[PDB]
Amino acid sequence: MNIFEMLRIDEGLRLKIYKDTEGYYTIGIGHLLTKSPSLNAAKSELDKAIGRNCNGVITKDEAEKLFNQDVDAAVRGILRNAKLKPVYDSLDAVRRCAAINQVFQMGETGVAGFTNSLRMLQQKRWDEAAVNLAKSRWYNQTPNRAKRVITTFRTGTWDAYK
Numbered sequence: 568m569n570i571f572e573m574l575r576i577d578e579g580l581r582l583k584i585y586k587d588t589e590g591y592y593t594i595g596i597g598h599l600l601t602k603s604p605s606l607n608a609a610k611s612e613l614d615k616a617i618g619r620n621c622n623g624v625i626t627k628d629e630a631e632k633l634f635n636q637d638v639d640a641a642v643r644g645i646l647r648n649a650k651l652k653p654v655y656d657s658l659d660a661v662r663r664c665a666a667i668n669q670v671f672q673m674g675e676t677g678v679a680g681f682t683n684s685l686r687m688l689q690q691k692r693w694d695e696a697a698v699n700l701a702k703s704r705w706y707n708q709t710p711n712r713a714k715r716v717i718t719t720f721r722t723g724t725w726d727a728y729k
């Protein structure tokens with residue numbers, strides 16, 4: 568298992584513009600296009616991102632391409648965050664995947680306000696952190712997924728992803 572397989576499991580793959588769980592225009596492997604509720608803004612965005620007029624549809628290769636960039640962007644976001652960097656580096660590899668997933672799903676922003684959890688993760692207080700983590704809108708809106716990630720933090724193994 569690795570970060571890509573992991574996130575490809577959590578986000579799925581779709582070749583046509585779609586609305587995510589928050590009702591936003593997305594495509595491929597969880598690639599957010601825009602927050603605006605205008606489809607046309609979305610297609611514009613899609614066009615800009617691929618480098619061609621897609622008319623709302625892309626190839627697998629194209630999705631995978633966006634995906635590579637996106638993973639990359641997430642990690643790099645982590646490492647550039649003073650609050651995040653230190654935690655992330657304190658962790659082992661599996662656990663690090665869990666951190667990327669959260670960041671991929673919610674942004675460096677969303678993750679930065681998980682102060683308390685962050686701290687607990689840094690201290691290696693696994694179960695403690697796992698409980699804290701659950702007390703959140705994130706867990707409550709996307710429970711199956713949050714569950715997987717949390718377990719991942721808690722145990723350091725890939726069991727949640729079987």
Ligand SMILES: C=CCc1cccc(C)c1O
Pocket residue numbers: 645651652654655665666667669670678681684685688
């Ligand atoms: C709940 C936060 C866990 C966490 C620790 C380190 C770095 C990132 C990006 C992260 O999401």
Ligand SMILES: [Cl-]
Pocket residue numbers: 615616617636
């Ligand atoms: Cl792009």
Ligand SMILES: [Cl-]
Pocket residue numbers: 708709710711712713
């Ligand atoms: Cl879910």
